[PDB]
Design a binder for this molecule. Structure first.
Ligand SMILES: N[C@@H]1[C@@H](O)[C@H](O[C@@H]2O[C@H](CO)[C@@H](O[C@@H]3O[C@H](CO)[C@@H](O[C@@H]4O[C@H](CO)[C@@H](O[C@@H]5O[C@H](CO)[C@@H](O[C@@H]6O[C@H](CO)[C@@H](O)[C@H](O)[C@H]6N)[C@H](O)[C@H]5N)[C@H](O)[C@H]4N)[C@H](O)[C@H]3N)[C@H](O)[C@H]2N)[C@@H](CO)O[C@H]1O
Length: 236
């Protein structure tokens, strides 16, 4: 079976998401990413945009300090605990930004980021996609939704988005046509993307994922070409 967790499909998924987050297919270059993009989530960092506002950057740092005691970020745990649930930089700032840059040089921090990615975002996407009888492209649709909207049963989280899809169209696991199901899933997601100004550009769906679907590239196979934000990417 061709799934998004095969080595090449996973590598493709990482480049897709890095194009959407960082306008680069060079996903391995993004572990050191750190920016407050003025969305109200505070610091956004690393491969998949962990945030200081939403809990996951804190969870990542705590896991990193478990596996690598005394790393440069560990001293910023109390400040990450204090700012969680807000976009405050209080207690972080230049020393924290330099500590992120230092940690991103280490295989240990990259491994922590990979682990958090896989536990919270990638493995749930793939497992749920397979349960729904989706192809690699469908699993990808799930993974990008979890990256942007996060896990959860709320209407604006992955679980709610998937629920809304299922209300509109049967998944392939129940005999539904995959194209119709993914159209309904993209259209459920579109609604949610548009409710937030930082998310209102939907090009990561419209000029990339919908294009793969139109092309019938269900295995998300290379060569692949797409656009996001008006810029073209390709993978071979
Ligand atoms: N060549 C130029 C172009 O570059 C230029 O275009 C710009 O290009 C920028 C660079 O690529 C681009 O910036 C990126 O924009 C995106 C979209 O805003 C940013 O993406 C962010 O992705 C984060 C991913 O992690 C999101 O974070 C997640 O948020 C969710 C929802 O809050 C959370 O979920 C909760 O999690 C908890 C568990 O912790 C759970 O309890 C809850 O239930 C969950 N719901 C996650 O925790 C969190 N990780 C974030 O939402 C999202 N905004 C990215 O960072 C930017 N770098 C620009 O957008 C783009 N315009 C163009 C412009 O014209 O010009 C060309 O010439």
């Amino acid at each position: 079976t061709v799934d998004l967790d095969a080595p090449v499909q996973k590598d493709t998924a990482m480049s897709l998401v890095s194009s959407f987050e960082n306008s680069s297919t060079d996903w391995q270059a993004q572990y050191g990413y750190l920016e407050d993009i003025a969305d109200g989530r505070g610091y956004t960092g690393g491969l998949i945009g962990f945030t200081s506002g939403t809990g996951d950057m804190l969870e990542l740092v705590r896991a990193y300090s478990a596996s690598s005691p005394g790393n440069p970020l560990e001293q910023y745990i109390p400040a990450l605990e204090a700012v969680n649930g807000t976009d405050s930089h209080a207690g972080l700032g230049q020393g924290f930004e330099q500590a992120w840059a230092d940690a991103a040089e280490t295989s240990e921090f990259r491994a922590a980021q990979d682990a958090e990615r896989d536990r919270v975002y990638f493995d749930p996407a793939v497992a749920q996609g397979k349960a729904d009888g989706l192809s690699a492209l469908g699993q990808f649709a799930y993974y990008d939704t979890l990256v942007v909207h996060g896990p959860g049963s709320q209407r604006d989280a992955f679980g709610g988005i998937r629920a809304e899809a299922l209300s509109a169209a049967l998944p392939p696991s129940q005999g539904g046509d995959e194209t119709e199901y993914l159209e309904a899933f993209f259209d459920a997601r579109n609604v949610i993307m548009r409710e937030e100004p930082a998310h209102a550009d939907t090009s990561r769906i419209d000029t990339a994922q919908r294009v793969f679907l139109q092309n019938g590239n269900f295995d998300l196979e290379r060569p692949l070409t797409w656009s996001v934000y008006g810029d073209q990417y390709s993978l071979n």
